[PDB]
Every structure is written in structure tokens, then in C-alpha cells.
Amino acid sequence: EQFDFDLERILKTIKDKNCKKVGLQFPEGLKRQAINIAREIEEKTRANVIISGNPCFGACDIDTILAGSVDILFHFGHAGMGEYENVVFIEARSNIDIIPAVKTALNLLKANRIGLITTVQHVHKLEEACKVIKEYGKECVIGKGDPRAIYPGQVLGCNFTAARVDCEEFIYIGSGIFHPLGVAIATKKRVIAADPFLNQAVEVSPERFLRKRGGYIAKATGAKIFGIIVSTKSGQYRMKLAQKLKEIADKHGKIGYIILMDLVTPEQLLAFKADAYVNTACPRITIDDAERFHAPVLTPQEFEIVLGERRWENMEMDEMI
């Protein structure tokens, strides 16, 4: 409901480092605060501000052109990714209480070893949730992150490393269906989604999602020409994979053309009129935004299946690691 910007710390950093030019980058939900924050910086420091106006979907999406034009770029809403010279990551952790939703999920647990995952805006609250589940008699573990998702318990739409742990079931804390869906697909374990805003908890089963999707990607079985999508965004670029996929298509008597872009949208893909697309950019596009693409959009593994390169199986999660 509210988010914590480290504003007094940002001002100190600017005044301490004597920055004269300061960049600001916000995910879409936080752009509503950009002008207010610019105002504070310009009124209380001698720096002048440039706000990034582009969509920003994550720490995978750094405005590197802006960073190369300022002394420091403050990037909000996301946990840091990569290692950039002058980019400072401002967490913006959420203050919503997750304990009621966790207790709500307790009566959906079957096993005794429970794992917890969440997104970055709640990772600071997992410790007290783990205490609650251990007080209810269960064992609880919070899996460690990797270089892409640094915080224990943190998952992304493209990274489920925190869910690779010695437990039997998971509780996902947060909103939406795609994160717990991905965890259930990645681990093949039971996942309860506990929404802290609604204080409701539901089992997220992947069988429906895998089954309907499998039947649909078989539409691409008959595709002859593929567009292989590559994004230039700072943390989504997979050109070497795209060139491997193009070679595998040719090996199997089909054709892929590499299409290089920044934003991946249906409007820009409709114009090319390939039979189907393979997405090497943000993998959440493939399973969410793709529902209203006019041609099939496949993960790299799904592409290999349609080609005959690998044997059929339900969709695995396309991870970036």
C-alpha cells in the first residue's frame, strides 16, 4: 500500500558525493512519485535531475543511456542486478503485514517441511513468517538466492533458485498467479499462494496451465518460419542463445530470423508475419502478455520441442541465470 524510499539517504548521498547531475529510474507503479522526488532533490541539493521516461520492468531493465549521462542513477523498486559503475539501487520495500495471510495458508499445508518464497518488496518479512510456521509445529526453510535474485526467499518471473531447497511444499507470499505458478512448475511441488492484501490463500495447481499450453504450442508444430526475439535491455539480452536457436531451426529444416528490439510488444511483432515466435527476452512475456499475440510465442525449450530437437514434455520455466 505504501513503499519506503530512502529519501533522506538519497539527499545525503547527493550532497556527500557533490553530485551535479542525478538520474532517476522508476518501475511503472512508482513513476507517480518521480516529480515529487525530483522536486526534493532540486530544492534541497544543488544537483539537477533527469527522470527516465521509458517503461522499466525490473533490475533487468537499467536505463544505461541515462546512467552514462549522469553522476549517479538511482533505480527504485527493485533489488540490484548486475554490477554498474554509478547505479544505486533503492529497495522500496513494502510495509504491508504478511503474517495474517501466512496464518490463513496454514490450514492448506499437508507436508511438514515448508518453504517460503516472495518477491523483493516482502523479503525482509520472511524471517518472522518462518518463526510463525515453526511455532505451528512445521519445519520452515527460506532458500538462498543466486547472483540474479540476491535475497533469500526471493523469486522473479525468470528465476526460481530460491525455491530449489530441501522442502516438500511452498507458501508463496504476494499477489498474482504467475509467480506461484512458476514455482509449482519449476519444483513439481505443491504451492499455496497467500495474498497479503486480500488475506486469502489458494492452492495454485499447474496441470491446467501446462495442459492447455501444451495443446496450443502444437499449433507451432506446423510453423515453417520463426521470428527469434532478442531484447537489448540490460538484463534480458540473450543473443548467443538466439543464434543457437537459429542454427537448430536450420538443422531441422526450418528457418528462424533474429529480431532485435528494446520493448517486445504485439504491435511490433504483428508486422513481421512470421508463423510463430520464440522469445529470448523477458520470459514472463511468453506466458502472460502472449495470450493476445496473434501467433504463438514459445519459450526456447518449447521451440526445441516443436523442432524435434528435444522430446516432448510439459513446459519448463524459462529461467535467466
How far is residue 179's CA from residue 1's CA, in Å, rounded to a whole number? Answer: 20
Out of 50, 106, 210, 241, the residue judged to bind a copy of itself by CB under 8 A: 50
Our CA angle for 76, 50, 9, nearest 5°, is 45
Cβ neighbours of residue 6 closer than 8 Å, sequence gap 6 or more? 90, 91
3-state secondary structure of 24: strand
Q: Considering the rule CB under 6 A, would residue 143 count as an interface residue with ligand SF4?
A: no
Nearest CA to 260 out of 299, 293, 231 is that of 231
Q: Considering the rule CB under 8 A, would residue 35 count as an interface residue with a copy of itself?
A: yes
Least distance to ligand SAH from the beta carbon of 297, Å?
11
Beta bridge partners of 193: 172, 202
Q: Considering the rule CB under 6 A, would residue 120 count as an interface residue with ligand SF4?
A: no
**Beta strand 190-195 with 200-203: parallel, antiparallel or unpaired?**
antiparallel
Q: State the binding partner of 271 from a copy of itself, ligand SF4, ligand SAH, none, CB within 5 to 8 A by kind.
A: a copy of itself
The torsion angles phi and psi of 76, rounded to 5 degrees, stand at: -110, 160
Q: How is residue 125 written as a grid cell?
A: 518479512
Pick the piece of the chain touching ligand SF4 (CB under 6 A) from 1-9, 98-106, 137-145, 154-162.
154-162
Q: State the binding partner of 169 from a copy of itself, ligand SF4, ligand SAH, none, CB within 5 to 8 A by kind.
A: none
Instruction: Show the binding pattern over residues 274-313: x = contacts ligand SAH (CB under 6 A), - = does not.
Output: -------xx-xx--xx------------------------
User: How many residues interact with a copy of itself (rule CB under 8 A)?
Assistant: 40
The torsion angles phi and psi of 215, rounded to 5 degrees, stand at: -65, -30
User: Which C-beta is closer to ligand SAH: that of 45 or that of 283?
Assistant: 283
Q: Residue positions in the annotated binding site for [4Fe-4S] cluster?
A: 60, 158, 282
Q: Rule CB under 6 A: which residues touch ligand SAH?
A: 57-58, 119, 156-158, 231, 233, 236, 263-265, 281-282, 284-285, 288-289
